Symmetry: D2
Subunit: 276 residues, 4 copies
């Protein structure tokens, strides 16, 4: 009774007839993996789930990122608590693909809607696959093969740390650990083989094989193009919603329009491999 309902041609599907708060069968797991590989972002409603059950579900689709440093559920360091009462989430109101400044950016995440404002706070997703397919041939030919630099300081500039000398040293220290690195501009999905634009406003600073000026123009083009209505969907949250997206070929945008209302989410991140 596992049911997959596509939400739009470019990406997105809703799933029902499966209780992911319990161990799912092999068949169900594989049915959802296929849906992910096809639709890239999956939604389930009326699916309450605790962090332990959320981790047990996400771990079925890859290894989980362990964290004791970020806002965690004490019992499960595999599930991250996102609380607007504790952490400002304003910088999520930008198109981004998660941790693309890493050598192996996250495979994806399972997100749980715990506490929501009456309304507002939508999240959008955009398909790198659909976006890439819609580019003109000559543009696809040129970009496929090129590489781009990703740098965490684009989303975490010096001013976001502090104007104090020790805030400056912290910024230099985290920079040493996460120096700028490169990924293909057109990424081949490691499972499905589907090609996708793999730059995002959050982290992409430079198309390496173009000049600074040429790069600025192309990236501004690609940033605007890839986030067009044709390549995206918009989710209006309800409590107990669950979202499961493939971070290897999407970007997303957390609309910040509900301050100072409290919003609480739970996140489990699935580890990814090297983009090629």
């Amino acid at each position: 009774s596992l049911t997959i309902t596509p939400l739009s041609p470019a990406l997105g599907a809703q799933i029902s007839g499966v209780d992911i708060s319990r161990d799912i069968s092999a068949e169900e797991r594989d049915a959802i993996e296929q849906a992910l590989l096809q639709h890239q972002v999956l939604f389930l409603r009326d699916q309450p789930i605790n962090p332990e059950q959320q981790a047990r579900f996400a771990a079925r689709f890859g290894d989980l990122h362990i964290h004791p440093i970020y806002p965690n559920v004490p019992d499960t360091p595999q599930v991250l608590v996102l609380d607007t009462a504790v952490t400002d989430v304003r910088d999520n109101a930008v198109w981004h693909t998660d941790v693309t400044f890493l050598p192996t950016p996250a495979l994806g995440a399972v997100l749980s809607a715990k506490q929501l404002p009456a309304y507002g706070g939508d999240t959008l997703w955009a398909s790198g696959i659909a976006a890439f397919e819609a580019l003109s041939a000559p543009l696809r030919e040129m970009l496929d093969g090129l590489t781009a630099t990703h740098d965490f300081t684009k989303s975490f500039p010096l001013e976001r740390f502090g104007t104090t000398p020790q805030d400056l040293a912290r910024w230099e220290a985290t920079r040493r650990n996460n120096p700028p690195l490169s990924h293909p501009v057109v990424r081949t999905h490691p499972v499905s083989g589907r090609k996708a634009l793999f730059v995002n406003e959050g982290f992409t600073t430079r198309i390496n094989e173009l000049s600074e000026l040429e790069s600025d123009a192309l990236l501004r083009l690609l940033f605007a193009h890839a986030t067009r209505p044709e390549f995206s969907i918009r989710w209006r949250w309800q409590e107990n919603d669950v979202a499961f997206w493939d971070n290897r070929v999407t970007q997303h945008f957390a609309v910040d329009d509900y301050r100072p209302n409290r919003r609480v989410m739970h996140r489990a991140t699935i580890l990814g491999d090297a983009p090629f």
Copy 2:
């Protein structure tokens, strides 16, 4: 009974518990009027209506438009049939405010969904009001009081329409009937007094008081800014949905991602006055 559920802080509400296939009470009409003034675009689901019913409901909020040349219902001259089998709708996939090239652009419209593709074909709306209020003070200050040229030919260029030296007669005649005219860049709603950005990439060509080079840069900015996620919503159609929007302070976008599948909408347009 009648309930009004906001969909987003910027714009949009859903109304249910009111049967608009039958005459609505003066109180219902007034409630919906206020909802429109507040939320700018209203949605009702599971609301089947024939053309005649659609017209008397629409007529409750202003005078309806009679169009003889465009495809409409035989007996109801004021309800327009939008059928993808008959007419192509590719150029609706562009942020536009309806007929802003006229001295008195449409007040708004009532739209009914008759026949829908299995999925796809979402429509987005954007609040000129929310967009304006989100601009910096120095920008609101400079823009408020300026005027802008709206040109029919920007959506209906020569190569796209008037494709024959025989059809060109139809172009030269319309280009001669609807010359470029101007409207305030910042419009004051004629009923609520709420101020809204009143430009759209669909018809706006030039900010009159700025130079060509200046205007181009400002419009590129405003076009991007006014359609950011913060100021918009996305509606996934279901048959028998009704949409009711205020075309005096909004823009909309009809995603064309369902070709060649058939889509059929019915529209009643409400006449507006001069923007000031």
Copy 3:
């Protein structure tokens, strides 16, 4: 004898030691032709000439264009009088390659400075050859082979000329006689074989093999790139100067900073062939 002093690495050269008011020798002609093929735009100071001599000189380098109605010298329908007291030149203050909306844009022109303001009215030239060569390999790979639309209406909007029943018929006839056409984005010089960027902000409206959106970004990039200082020169005019440029691989820009002072130039235009 003949002396050729390069002005800048990208383009431009001053020539001396030849009196072009008299018939030049074959060897001199060929020396100047070679300098044109190398330096693209040539300058001769202290070379007074009448229209008769200027036409005789120009004709040694290709067939001359004949235009009666356009302000010219009665004795020499080959030489055109450009007088700011008669014709507004405000529209030459934009980067353009001459008549690229024609299937055979001009080969070049020989220009003579008759009367000049005390100061101002500089003319700049840009090299399409140096600009193309400085592009990144990927960009050159992509552009080399594409085509672009050229349209005179980009520089001559109907709102610029024509209001009378005749004036409107005057425009529609011209537009009818000069439909948009295409030229290669990367032109191969039909003599030297050198490759040049062949788009200009004056006339180029669209790169054909790209979408409107993609084209728009690429042209803005190219318009800016091709006119950077690295690829251009700026001539400060003196009376009796003669300029001779290859219009097949350059753009130029006439600075209008001398109003209302009078400026009179004489121009002989050399017919060109089909760009490829």
Copy 4:
């Protein structure tokens, strides 16, 4: 006989009939000063001078900046040596106003041409006074009173000097000692009272009173606007040339199109005050 020859309406003048290898009379000093205030950038040809003579001249127009490290010139540290054999000048091929990241950017500079390549290495100057006046009134009104951040790391980013650990703590301290700071977008010349645009692509990163998105669009507009031909001049150097410009209301650009040929200039910087 001190003679002043205006080169172009927007800015620039050539001065002759004065030997600046020797002391200048008060009458001359004041004439040059007035010429500086009117024309913003002054050029003298055939004026061979040595470091001592050059400092004596520049000192007549304000207090000179001392170069305490690696001088060059030993006996005259007020004169910096710019030799491409030792220093890469590629960075100067960008539109910039000198040290605007300092609270009191340089008043101006006296530059001497010691050794030049056969050709190439032109320098351009642009007038912020002429640029400001050419803006539309609405735009002049909005900008006049705003402030912009200047940051040296815009021109000198970390990846400009290497990961050599010495530079990691050495460069880190340079940013600590030169943090981002602000200046008026529209500067009032402290002597003449003439208003000028005071932003430059070199160091200006953000218009403060606007959002990042708005600032981005505006600065892109201004950067292009201020460097248009209308507002600029181009100087083709000769050995023994002297340039003397006002860095309070202009920006300049050094073309790097002569590598690897050797270029040697001597520079004397006049200290400036706080922009307002």
